Amino acid sequence: MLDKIVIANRGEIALRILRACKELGIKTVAVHSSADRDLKHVLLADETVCIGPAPSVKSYLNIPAIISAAEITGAVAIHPGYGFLSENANFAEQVERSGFIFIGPKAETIRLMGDKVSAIAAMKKAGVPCVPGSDGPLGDDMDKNRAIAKRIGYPVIIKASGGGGGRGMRVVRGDAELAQSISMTRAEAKAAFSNDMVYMEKYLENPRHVEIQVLADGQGNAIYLAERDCSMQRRHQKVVEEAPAPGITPELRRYIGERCAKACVDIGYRGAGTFEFLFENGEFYFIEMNTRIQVEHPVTEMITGVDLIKEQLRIAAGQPLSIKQEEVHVRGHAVECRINAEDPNTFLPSPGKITRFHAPGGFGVRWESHIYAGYTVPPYYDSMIGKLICYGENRDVAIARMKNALQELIIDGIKTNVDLQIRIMNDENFQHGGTNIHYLEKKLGL
Numbered sequence: 102m103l104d105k106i107v108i109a110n111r112g113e114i115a116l117r118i119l120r121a122c123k124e125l126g127i128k129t130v131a132v133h134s135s136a137d138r139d140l141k142h143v144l145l146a147d148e149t150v151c152i153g154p155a156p157s158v159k160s161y162l163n164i165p166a167i168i169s170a171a172e173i174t175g176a177v178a179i180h181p182g183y184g185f186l187s188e189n190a191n192f193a194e195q196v197e198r199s200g201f202i203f204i205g206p207k208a209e210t211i212r213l214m215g216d217k218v219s220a221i222a223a224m225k226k227a228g229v230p231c232v233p234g235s236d237g238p239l240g241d242d243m244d245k246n247r248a249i250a251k252r253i254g255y256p257v258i259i260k261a262s263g264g265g266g267g268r269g270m271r272v273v274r275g276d277a278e279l280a281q282s283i284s285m286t287r288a289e290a291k292a293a294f295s296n297d298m299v300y301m302e303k304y305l306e307n308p309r310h311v312e313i314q315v316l317a318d319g320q321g322n323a324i325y326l327a328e329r330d331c332s333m334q335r336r337h338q339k340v341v342e343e344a345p346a347p348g349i350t351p352e353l354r355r356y357i358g359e360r361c362a363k364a365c366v367d368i369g370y371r372g373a374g375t376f377e378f379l380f381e382n383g384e385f386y387f388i389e390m391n392t393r394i395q396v397e398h399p400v401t402e403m404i405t406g407v408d409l410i411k412e413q414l415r416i417a418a419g420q421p422l423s424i425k426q427e428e429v430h431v432r433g434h435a436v437e438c439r440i441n442a443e444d445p446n447t448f449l450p451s452p453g454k455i456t457r458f459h460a461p462g463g464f465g466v467r468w469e470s471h472i473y474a475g476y477t478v479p480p481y482y483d484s485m486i487g488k489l490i491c492y493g494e495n496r497d498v499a500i501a502r503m504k505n506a507l508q509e510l511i512i513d514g515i516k517t518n519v520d521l522q523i524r525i526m527n528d529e530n531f532q533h534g535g536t537n538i539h540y541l542e543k544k545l546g547l
């Protein structure tokens with residue numbers, strides 16, 4: 102087991118990781134910005150290092166300062182969490198070059214999955230079903246580009262290869278808009294990613310977001326831990342996630358899951374990972390892979406009993422997966438509501454001092470948050486301040502428990518989305534299940 106690790110993150114995920122470390126006897130180093138001295142996990146850590154001022158560029162994205170902190174403390178590994186540097190291949194490369202363990206895949210694998218064109222080619226080769234598309238980058242030849250779009254069939258979507266998660270894309274519904282659409286996506290991708298490579302896919306009209314959780318160790322074991330539905334979104338940002346995905350049969354789960362595990366083996370994947378699919382008319386289509394642990398990992402933990410952060414740590418230390426595929430069983434149902442410090446009308450971040458705080462409790466209730474009474478939410482970081490996860494023997498119980506837990510949650514002094522979450526839980530279509538990726542924005546517009 103790893104003696105000591107730097108937690109290269111903040112907020113709820115840093116606390117999530119700290120608890121896993123404590124359970125395993127692993128010493129913790131909390132690197133933090135000067136605005137995050139009073140973070141819960143910082144106050145609980147074995148050692149703390151202030152790595153820079155509030156702005157992320159000089160703290161949580163500051164590669165030299167993070168690696169220096171690992172060096173000075175005698176840490177052996179760095180857990181990147183999600184966001185920040187977690188999908189940064191050069192960071193992972195530098196960490197390993199510096200002689201520390203990066204809690205994640207090899208830098209090569211991060212790089213492969215961050216290049217959406219090469220990722221898709223690897224998945225298609227591995228037997229993972231993908232979206233009909235260009236199978237390659239689009240060039241400047243607009244006659245060729247029109248031919249590709251005709252072959253695929255309109256509507257199509259142009260996507261940046263260095264992009265992802267709704268960033269760097271636009272829908273094309275006919276020839277007339279194709280040239281300008283490619284040109285604009287390209288320009289935006291050059292500006293944002295210093296990588297102007299774009300590709301084409303069939304635009305799916307009403308899909309669900311269904312993603313598969315995997316774990317792969319360094320002993321060659323790779324398993325899938327069912328799926329999550331993350332269709333409830335606003336501006337491509339997940340709002341609600343659940344596990345398992347409604348309407349997914351054990352046969353479908355097994356079908357897609359086995360293909361994801363096989364793909365892990367083929368590419369030499371290591372650690373936690375997530376295969377993102379669009380699901381429509383009973384079919385999966387791979388869009389992208391995330392190499393990090395994700396925000397919504399707790400719903401998977403609730404229905405499988407597998408602690409995914411502890412698995413990440415075990416994997417990094419050279420231990421094999423603690424469970425076999427035949428030992429992984431979907432039991433019950435879990436829903437996660439993200440709690441955001443945001444204005445209800447503008448949807449803009451609403452930072453400030455929490456004056457009164459109360460967490461919900463009870464059977465099946467899991468509150469993932471660093472917030473406490475008197476804690477100030479800084480303006481410099483993401484608006485997500487907590488995660489409410491509720492588990493039940495079935496979906497109706499999980500949702501019932503979520504409604505009750507949301508009503509117990511008190512966060513005064515700042516504006517939050519608790520009222521919105523309650524509205525979603527009470528939404529008749531959500532209660533039926535299987536709403537698509539456009540539902541929430543449609544509901545909010547009505």
Ligand SMILES: Nc1nc(N)nc(OCCOc2ccccc2)n1
Nearest residue numbers: 232258267302303304305306308388
């Ligand atoms: N609908 C859809 N089709 C394809 N081929 N790819 C993706 O990627 C996810 C990007 O998300 C959206 C969501 C709504 C509108 C446009 C893109 N979506």
Ligand SMILES: [Cl-]
Nearest residue numbers: 183394395396
């Ligand atoms: Cl994430």
